[PDB]
Design a protein around this ligand. Sequence first.
Ligand SMILES: [Mg+2]
Ligand SMILES: [Mg+2]
Lengths: 131, 131
Amino acid sequence: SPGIWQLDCTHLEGKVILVAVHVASGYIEAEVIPAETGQETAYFLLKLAGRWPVKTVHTDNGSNFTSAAVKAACWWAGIKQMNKELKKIIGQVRDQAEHLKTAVQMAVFIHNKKRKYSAGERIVDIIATDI
Amino acid sequence: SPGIWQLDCTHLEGKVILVAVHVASGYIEAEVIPAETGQETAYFLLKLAGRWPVKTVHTDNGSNFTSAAVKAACWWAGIKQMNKELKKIIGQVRDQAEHLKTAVQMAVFIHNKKRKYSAGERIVDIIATDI
Ligand SMILES: [Mg+2]
Ligand SMILES: [Mg+2]
């Protein structure tokens, strides 16, 4: 289904990377956050939902979605209830950037633009078709 | 052309909001930033470019794109060289959220989901067609 996304946090260099995967396409978006918190997850969800038609979200850690901030964002946006390779692509590009956050976005870019149709093409195609 | 975007900063409550508009569709993305700086603009561009096929970017303030950080991000991503109404939608929703940044994302969401075909549908349709 085109409205399904998966959301998890990974850890790297004492930092937290939030990663959302559009399940059908393989397209990702990520952010480096300071803390793994409800407030950061809510904010991220709100951004994601203004951009794509987000219907449902899954996670591998259920307690991620327990905070009032998260429930409030899901309620308002109408939302209902790669991490290893991204880390490889990040390893590759790490030297090219000072800050981890920039390396993360370079890795997202590479992952989404790689044909092997790319994930960024697949997401747009799946969403347009569903309109 | 589907690869054209416009990028500007506006000011609100002592804070900076970066706003990118996909010119053909009217779709926007925004972030609240602390400082109007080259480093924040570069980072934003890198995020935007991993997500959509960004070919060219325009701004109303040319000096925005002068920093080495910006030029380096445009170089790497292969990029070449609403603000009033968004502020209205933000005024409307301001009370519903504590922090300006959340109000901003609510306003982006509203702007992109409004049919009056929405901007979020138009962007996906224009990009898919161009593939
Ligand atoms: Mg997790
Ligand atoms: Mg400006």
